[PDB]
């Protein structure tokens, strides 16, 4: 586990058609102040009557203070997020895939969600939500360790050659 | 009350495409009505603006497979 | 001679064994005279900063070295603040002539958020020949970047959960705004 | 052919103390001889210079247990 995996489940006490409509109208809302920008950057209806959309959000970068001090070059930049979706009215399902496309060296959060008719109540909507949190910094830590070990081993050779040099010089004054 | 587009010049085109798209979505699409897209012209007008704004801001959205890989 | 290394827990552990074909007393004397030598151009500065003899006739010393900071370029870009600084290294030692052993413990005291290398070495009379000296060398290579990686990941997960709550409350706000008009 | 001290003004003092110590180490200490130390006043003068230089350069050597224990 360098990648953290999340699995979640939610119920919206509204019907699937209301939820699917609300999906496109939910911004702005009182809980979305961190969402600054919203655009559709691609949209088509497929032959099997599926709606394919790609939505671009810009969001505020809000980092704990310690990460601001460690990652100064990231503090100034907003987060850009793509949300791909497939809306399928024939099966009353919607599938979404959301991930940040910048700050990607620092961390990537990917979310895959499925919206469907609540199995207990046909008037409600369940959401099954999967997420993966990854950071290329684990690979950087390993590269730094491997460099440290390589330099240490090289310096051991220099240490011993240096010892042999001075002992030969001292043996006979 | 409404969101801004990522391009300021595109916001009012966005507000008008979204508003049209929502009417078509609830009344035709979700109801299975297969008559073609109503808001087509509003969309590529809107697109033309935002796509330029995206390149201008260097938002790196190109070459990204749909729904991930 | 031989050596090996492997992980400990995101710590890399090294164990090495070598021999000097010189007697223990010559090696212990040479320890103090080995700088400078043709293989030590990266060692810029050398000082004793503590030294005493114990009641049991052991020599306790602390030697401070300044060493050149030579990082690969990818690491310079990642760690711009580390490039201008040499490495400061402390070497603690116990010389025990009654038992013909010397023990050293060497580690960097700066650059310590980026990595720490700790080396523990024991010099003793070689078991096979009285005129040789053997060295048992252990080392630990660690980096606080692993703990940083985990902390970044934990803040990403926490913020994600918080956004899920906001997403759901947002849905509930707009559903109620939509179900109040028709 | 001799090492520099981290303190620029200290290097000759370091060099004079080191070779006094080398002689005492090899000829007395390593042979179990307990004639104290003949280099203490070289050492005290040398430490005064170098401990000063370590503070001015803010080298962080304080508070560090011996042999990392
Ligand atoms: C310091 C910022 C780096 C990472 C930004 C994380 C943004 C999350 C992208 C995936 C969002 C899933 C949807 C959601 O949060 O509700
Ligand atoms: C980028 C600087 C990171 C830390 C520097 C490593 C210094 C090594 C300290 C331990 C030295 C043991 C002796 C040796 O390496 O030969
Ligand atoms: Cl605020
Ligand atoms: Cl976010
Ligand atoms: Cl940075
Ligand atoms: Cl239907
Ligand atoms: Cl970025
Ligand atoms: Cl890397
Ligand atoms: Cl190297
Ligand atoms: Cl026109
Ligand atoms: Cl020395
Ligand atoms: Cl960093
Ligand atoms: Cl930095
Ligand atoms: Cl440092
Ligand atoms: Cl931390
Ligand atoms: Na506010
Ligand atoms: Na950057
Ligand atoms: Na149907």
XYZ file of C-alpha atoms and ligand atoms in Angstrom:
541
model
C 0.000 0.000 0.000
C 1.602 3.100 -1.250
C -1.874 3.938 -2.616
C -4.636 4.547 -0.066
C -7.944 2.992 -1.145
C -11.340 4.275 0.032
C -14.721 2.622 -0.328
C -17.951 4.452 0.566
C -21.735 4.322 0.225
C -24.354 7.101 0.396
C -28.136 7.346 -0.079
C -29.892 10.436 -1.506
C -33.571 10.411 -0.432
C -34.554 11.629 -3.938
C -35.389 9.784 -7.126
C -32.737 8.882 -9.662
C -34.010 11.343 -12.269
C -33.953 14.255 -9.776
C -30.399 13.337 -8.665
C -29.132 13.048 -12.258
C -30.578 16.514 -13.067
C -29.197 17.959 -9.817
C -25.755 16.646 -10.815
C -25.474 19.390 -13.434
C -26.986 22.155 -11.298
C -25.371 21.532 -7.945
C -22.813 24.382 -8.229
C -22.862 26.902 -6.736
C -24.244 25.877 -3.347
C -23.470 26.915 0.227
C -20.963 23.998 0.593
C -19.041 24.717 -2.653
C -17.195 28.003 -1.950
C -13.915 26.188 -2.735
C -15.271 25.502 -6.245
C -14.337 28.577 -8.311
C -14.936 27.631 -11.982
C -17.057 25.088 -13.834
C -17.118 24.209 -17.538
C -18.254 21.450 -19.856
C -15.275 20.791 -22.108
C -16.734 17.834 -23.953
C -20.236 16.383 -24.314
C -21.876 13.877 -26.667
C -24.789 11.425 -26.871
C -23.711 7.946 -27.957
C -25.696 5.702 -30.339
C -26.931 3.628 -27.358
C -28.279 6.902 -25.867
C -25.570 7.461 -23.224
C -24.482 11.015 -22.388
C -20.697 11.413 -22.228
C -19.473 14.558 -20.522
C -16.167 15.935 -19.333
C -16.483 18.737 -16.793
C -13.577 20.973 -15.722
C -13.530 22.514 -12.242
C -10.995 24.872 -10.747
C -10.845 24.661 -6.950
C -8.981 26.518 -4.273
C -5.738 24.940 -3.070
C -6.095 24.619 0.681
C -3.149 22.985 2.339
C -2.208 22.637 5.976
C 0.467 25.081 6.973
C 3.191 22.405 7.227
C 2.642 21.439 3.598
C 2.741 25.082 2.553
C 6.199 25.358 4.106
C 7.372 22.117 2.503
C 5.769 22.713 -0.937
C 6.164 26.483 -1.567
C 5.900 26.160 -5.330
C 2.435 24.569 -5.004
C 0.859 27.204 -2.704
C 0.084 29.787 -5.394
C -1.796 27.451 -7.750
C -5.448 26.442 -7.837
C -6.325 22.763 -8.343
C -7.707 21.742 -11.747
C -10.077 18.785 -11.709
C -11.620 16.733 -14.511
C -14.866 14.803 -14.023
C -15.761 12.318 -16.739
C -19.255 10.914 -16.645
C -21.606 8.488 -18.389
C -25.319 9.060 -17.826
C -27.481 6.067 -18.898
C -31.220 6.705 -18.517
C -32.157 3.311 -19.918
C -30.529 1.564 -16.942
C -30.993 4.453 -14.507
C -27.282 4.643 -13.790
C -24.609 7.261 -13.861
C -20.849 6.560 -13.562
C -18.301 9.276 -12.784
C -14.481 9.450 -12.711
C -12.919 12.551 -11.078
C -9.215 13.421 -10.641
C -6.863 16.371 -10.365
C -4.805 17.120 -13.437
C -2.277 19.500 -11.803
C -0.306 19.321 -8.524
C 0.191 15.756 -9.774
C 3.733 15.315 -8.428
C 2.498 16.165 -4.950
C -0.603 13.966 -4.935
C -3.309 12.447 -7.126
C -6.825 11.764 -5.794
C -9.000 9.715 -8.121
C -12.690 8.984 -7.433
C -14.959 6.554 -9.281
C -18.656 6.797 -8.359
C -21.775 4.901 -9.460
C -25.290 6.325 -8.987
C -28.211 3.918 -9.207
C -31.770 3.366 -7.935
C -31.692 2.562 -4.212
C -32.300 -1.182 -3.921
C -34.438 -0.753 -0.784
C -36.523 2.155 -2.067
C -37.312 2.854 -5.731
C -37.860 6.587 -4.877
C -34.253 7.004 -3.645
C -30.749 6.888 -5.095
C -27.669 5.087 -3.809
C -24.069 6.151 -4.509
C -21.178 3.692 -4.421
C -17.919 5.661 -4.229
C -14.302 4.404 -4.668
C -11.229 6.610 -4.275
C -7.425 6.197 -4.568
C -4.964 8.668 -2.976
C -1.413 8.375 -4.326
C 1.723 10.526 -4.126
C 4.850 10.395 -6.282
C 6.720 11.430 -3.123
C 7.029 7.748 -2.129
C 9.123 7.206 -5.260
C 11.134 10.341 -4.423
C 11.833 9.065 -0.895
C 13.112 5.775 -2.375
C 15.298 7.591 -4.919
C 16.794 9.739 -2.140
C 17.481 6.652 -0.024
C 19.080 4.811 -2.941
C 21.291 7.823 -3.679
C 22.249 8.025 0.041
C 23.187 4.338 0.107
C 25.161 4.568 -3.152
C 27.098 7.533 -1.848
C 27.744 5.798 1.475
C 29.106 2.686 -0.270
C 31.302 4.791 -2.528
C 32.617 6.672 0.537
C 33.371 3.378 2.315
C 35.701 2.532 -0.623
C 37.282 5.972 -0.339
C 37.598 5.502 3.424
C 39.437 2.157 3.088
C 41.690 3.277 0.237
C 42.514 6.314 2.376
C 43.355 4.084 5.361
C 45.632 1.953 3.149
C 47.329 5.087 1.799
C 48.139 6.458 5.245
C 49.150 3.100 6.719
C 51.608 2.501 3.795
C 52.945 6.003 4.330
C 53.332 5.437 8.071
C 55.019 2.019 7.718
C 58.590 3.219 7.231
C 57.928 6.863 8.238
C -26.111 32.343 -7.946
C -24.479 30.957 -11.120
C -20.909 29.675 -11.644
C -18.239 31.428 -13.616
C -16.559 29.780 -16.549
C -12.779 29.434 -16.436
C -12.781 32.073 -19.164
C -14.436 35.315 -18.038
C -15.494 36.069 -21.606
C -17.292 32.665 -21.673
C -19.449 32.947 -18.512
C -22.622 34.339 -20.014
C -22.377 31.876 -22.909
C -22.076 29.192 -20.248
C -25.096 30.408 -18.278
C -27.214 30.234 -21.431
C -26.009 26.830 -22.601
C -26.361 25.217 -19.148
C -29.898 26.656 -18.811
C -30.924 25.252 -22.203
C -29.074 21.948 -21.624
C -30.905 21.404 -18.341
C -34.330 21.819 -19.990
C -33.455 19.300 -22.709
C -31.882 16.909 -20.172
C -34.879 16.658 -17.848
C -37.577 16.751 -20.518
C -36.154 14.743 -23.421
C -32.980 12.911 -22.413
C -34.030 11.413 -19.086
C -37.387 10.555 -20.623
C -35.794 8.641 -23.461
C -36.861 11.066 -26.169
C -34.359 10.434 -28.928
C -34.960 13.625 -30.902
C -31.583 15.296 -31.381
C -29.789 17.860 -29.242
C -31.672 21.152 -28.922
C -28.781 23.309 -27.558
C -26.286 22.316 -30.201
C -25.561 25.855 -31.569
C -25.280 27.369 -28.035
C -22.767 24.608 -27.226
C -20.165 25.075 -29.972
C -20.321 28.818 -29.532
C -19.675 28.256 -25.817
C -16.990 25.702 -26.686
C -15.137 28.021 -29.060
C -14.709 30.533 -26.228
C -13.681 28.142 -23.417
C -11.300 26.095 -25.543
C -9.354 29.264 -26.343
C -9.484 30.280 -22.667
C -8.162 26.848 -21.664
C -5.159 27.031 -23.984
C -4.499 30.622 -22.896
C -4.320 29.474 -19.242
C -2.362 26.311 -20.171
C -4.907 24.077 -18.395
C -3.404 20.639 -19.304
C -6.551 18.776 -20.451
C -5.311 17.241 -23.712
C -4.353 13.633 -24.366
C -6.325 12.318 -21.350
C -8.305 9.154 -21.962
C -11.987 9.276 -21.035
C -12.966 7.840 -17.618
C -9.263 7.235 -16.887
C -6.833 4.399 -17.575
C 35.567 -8.803 2.419
C 31.813 -8.735 1.933
C 28.828 -6.524 2.529
C 25.116 -6.525 2.041
C 22.091 -4.304 2.477
C 18.320 -4.639 2.659
C 15.319 -2.791 4.003
C 14.574 -2.439 7.733
C 11.199 -0.455 7.551
C 11.750 2.250 4.919
C 15.140 2.313 6.628
C 17.928 0.677 4.572
C 20.338 -1.386 6.672
C 23.910 -2.134 5.576
C 26.395 -4.595 7.054
C 29.982 -4.730 5.814
C 33.132 -6.500 6.874
C 36.628 -5.632 5.808
C 40.208 -6.157 6.851
C 43.234 -3.901 7.009
C 46.555 -5.739 6.705
C 48.049 -3.651 9.542
C 48.190 -4.153 13.301
C 45.453 -2.742 15.524
C 47.737 -0.116 17.071
C 48.817 1.187 13.630
C 45.198 1.323 12.473
C 44.088 3.178 15.622
C 46.896 5.700 15.135
C 46.152 6.062 11.433
C 42.486 6.802 12.225
C 43.562 10.234 13.443
C 45.952 10.912 10.534
C 44.011 9.654 7.561
C 42.931 13.132 6.390
C 43.870 14.519 3.986
C 44.598 11.711 1.516
C 44.138 11.306 -2.262
C 40.637 9.723 -1.718
C 39.319 12.448 0.648
C 38.969 15.589 -1.514
C 35.252 15.782 -0.474
C 36.338 16.250 3.164
C 36.925 19.983 3.607
C 37.329 20.477 7.334
C 38.283 18.435 10.339
C 38.153 19.251 14.025
C 38.072 17.656 17.439
C 35.273 19.242 19.447
C 35.388 17.007 22.525
C 37.984 14.646 23.985
C 38.578 13.008 27.339
C 40.032 9.909 28.953
C 37.731 7.955 31.242
C 38.576 6.415 34.630
C 38.910 3.056 32.807
C 41.468 4.459 30.309
C 39.220 4.810 27.287
C 39.572 7.703 24.905
C 36.216 9.418 24.092
C 36.399 11.813 21.124
C 34.009 13.784 18.958
C 35.311 14.831 15.536
C 33.460 17.304 13.346
C 33.871 17.141 9.555
C 32.606 19.387 6.773
C 31.986 17.480 3.565
C 31.016 18.637 0.121
C 27.362 18.366 -0.741
C 27.226 16.705 -4.110
C 23.688 15.906 -5.092
C 22.325 14.674 -8.404
C 20.592 17.390 -10.399
C 17.121 15.913 -9.984
C 17.695 16.200 -6.261
C 18.908 19.812 -6.514
C 15.670 20.745 -8.277
C 13.629 18.966 -5.642
C 15.612 20.413 -2.722
C 16.724 23.911 -3.757
C 17.299 24.951 -0.152
C 19.817 22.170 0.387
C 22.146 23.036 -2.494
C 24.047 25.923 -0.874
C 24.969 23.941 2.286
C 27.888 21.616 2.916
C 27.254 18.496 4.973
C 28.220 18.618 8.646
C 29.174 15.222 10.028
C 29.925 14.140 13.594
C 32.025 11.111 14.421
C 31.976 9.859 18.016
C 34.555 7.269 18.994
C 35.661 5.182 21.950
C 39.239 3.868 21.778
C 39.849 1.000 24.250
C 43.545 -0.068 24.182
C 43.168 -2.586 27.018
C 40.786 -4.577 24.798
C 42.321 -3.462 21.486
C 39.030 -2.195 20.134
C 37.725 1.056 18.790
C 34.041 1.815 18.168
C 32.878 4.743 16.015
C 29.447 6.273 15.356
C 29.185 8.708 12.464
C 26.183 10.693 11.177
C 25.183 13.901 9.439
C 23.803 16.625 11.670
C 22.324 18.832 8.906
C 20.401 18.041 5.725
C 18.532 15.835 8.190
C 15.034 16.330 6.766
C 16.339 15.023 3.429
C 18.259 11.964 4.681
C 20.229 10.641 7.633
C 23.141 8.188 7.230
C 24.310 6.648 10.507
C 27.351 4.361 10.541
C 28.474 2.232 13.521
C 31.906 0.587 13.105
C 33.939 -1.699 15.356
C 37.691 -2.123 14.791
C 39.365 -5.118 16.386
C 42.282 -7.538 16.031
C 41.604 -9.950 13.218
C 40.801 -13.429 14.560
C 42.973 -15.235 11.964
C 46.121 -13.042 12.062
C 47.530 -10.952 14.900
C 49.059 -8.473 12.440
C 45.697 -7.637 10.813
C 42.745 -5.511 11.924
C 39.158 -6.238 11.057
C 36.328 -3.749 10.719
C 32.677 -4.552 11.201
C 30.679 -1.765 9.602
C 26.896 -1.243 10.061
C 24.902 1.561 8.519
C 21.312 2.881 8.465
C 20.089 5.117 5.636
C 16.778 6.820 6.493
C 14.709 9.656 5.077
C 11.965 11.687 6.704
C 10.497 11.968 3.168
C 8.680 8.691 3.765
C 6.821 10.267 6.706
C 6.154 13.335 4.556
C 4.741 11.117 1.781
C 2.396 9.470 4.269
C 1.369 12.823 5.749
C 0.559 14.253 2.300
C -1.467 11.138 1.559
C -3.324 11.446 4.889
C -4.171 15.107 4.253
C -5.366 14.203 0.735
C -7.669 11.507 2.149
C -8.996 13.784 4.908
C -9.723 16.586 2.414
C -11.388 14.078 0.068
C -13.722 12.900 2.873
C -14.532 16.503 3.710
C -15.316 17.235 0.038
C -17.588 14.127 -0.068
C -19.592 15.590 2.840
C -19.790 18.943 1.045
C -20.753 17.235 -2.208
C -23.624 15.387 -0.487
C -24.848 18.435 1.450
C -24.680 20.357 -1.823
C -26.810 17.673 -3.495
C -29.322 17.858 -0.684
C -29.440 21.648 -0.946
C -30.091 21.630 -4.656
C -32.553 18.671 -4.647
C -34.701 20.642 -2.170
C -34.377 23.784 -4.283
C -35.478 21.765 -7.355
C -38.322 19.847 -5.639
C -39.777 23.226 -4.637
C -40.517 24.280 -8.227
C -42.341 22.490 -11.053
C 48.946 17.958 3.278
C 47.338 18.923 6.643
C 43.592 19.531 7.243
C 41.918 22.894 7.674
C 39.877 23.675 10.743
C 36.248 24.764 10.316
C 37.507 27.940 11.994
C 39.849 29.904 9.723
C 41.885 31.331 12.622
C 42.197 27.911 14.297
C 44.038 25.790 11.742
C 47.609 26.232 13.018
C 46.422 25.615 16.579
C 44.612 22.506 15.334
C 47.743 21.299 13.552
C 50.019 21.802 16.557
C 47.548 20.105 18.882
C 46.993 17.160 16.501
C 50.623 16.130 16.227
C 51.173 16.535 19.979
C 48.189 14.240 20.400
C 49.444 11.732 17.785
C 52.741 11.363 19.700
C 51.020 10.935 23.087
C 48.430 8.537 21.607
C 50.876 6.185 19.874
C 53.656 6.318 22.451
C 51.759 6.572 25.777
C 48.000 5.974 25.574
C 48.069 2.949 23.269
C 50.848 1.430 25.393
C 48.774 1.798 28.568
C 50.839 4.696 29.913
C 48.980 7.021 32.262
C 51.057 10.219 32.122
C 47.847 12.260 31.961
C 48.107 14.453 28.845
C 50.913 16.837 27.788
C 48.674 18.500 25.171
C 46.031 20.009 27.453
C 47.076 23.624 27.055
C 47.336 23.253 23.281
C 43.877 21.658 23.504
C 42.319 24.382 25.644
C 43.633 27.132 23.373
C 42.498 25.238 20.279
C 38.997 24.560 21.654
C 38.544 28.237 22.572
C 39.158 29.223 18.969
C 37.117 26.470 17.352
C 34.119 26.555 19.708
C 33.879 30.271 18.972
C 33.962 29.577 15.214
C 31.268 26.895 15.571
C 28.880 29.393 17.207
C 29.556 32.153 14.667
C 28.861 29.652 11.893
C 25.824 28.271 13.807
C 26.979 24.654 13.347
C 24.312 22.724 15.336
C 26.465 20.430 17.512
C 24.809 21.083 20.882
C 22.389 18.731 22.611
C 23.592 15.550 20.859
C 24.146 12.520 23.085
C 27.484 10.778 22.743
C 27.539 7.836 20.234
C 23.870 8.488 19.474
C 22.708 6.794 22.708
C -2.999 19.856 -2.782
C -4.013 19.370 -3.860
C -3.661 18.063 -4.586
C -4.804 17.083 -4.923
C -6.201 17.635 -5.274
C -7.326 16.671 -4.951
C -8.620 16.944 -5.713
C -9.491 15.718 -5.698
C -9.690 15.161 -7.065
C -10.749 14.080 -6.975
C -11.968 14.718 -6.416
C -13.014 13.666 -6.195
C -14.364 14.358 -6.042
C -14.575 15.055 -4.725
O -13.611 15.493 -4.082
O -15.738 15.230 -4.251
C 22.540 15.316 0.950
C 23.278 15.030 2.280
C 22.679 13.855 3.028
C 23.414 13.207 4.215
C 24.921 13.053 4.031
C 25.493 11.683 4.397
C 26.700 11.762 5.331
C 27.152 10.429 5.856
C 27.198 10.346 7.354
C 27.778 8.977 7.748
C 29.127 8.862 7.160
C 29.721 7.500 7.423
C 31.060 7.440 6.738
C 30.923 7.378 5.237
O 29.876 7.755 4.619
O 31.900 6.943 4.570
Cl -13.984 31.882 3.014
Cl -10.110 19.897 -3.499
Cl 9.234 23.339 -4.040
Cl -36.255 5.831 -18.867
Cl 0.835 22.287 -10.313
Cl 12.591 10.421 -8.854
Cl 27.575 8.496 -5.645
Cl -23.238 33.878 -35.776
Cl 42.055 14.130 14.061
Cl 10.048 18.579 -1.396
Cl 12.977 23.861 -0.398
Cl 20.451 21.579 6.218
Cl 4.803 16.303 8.525
Na -16.474 33.029 3.224
Na 5.168 23.592 -9.702
Na -36.976 3.062 -20.178
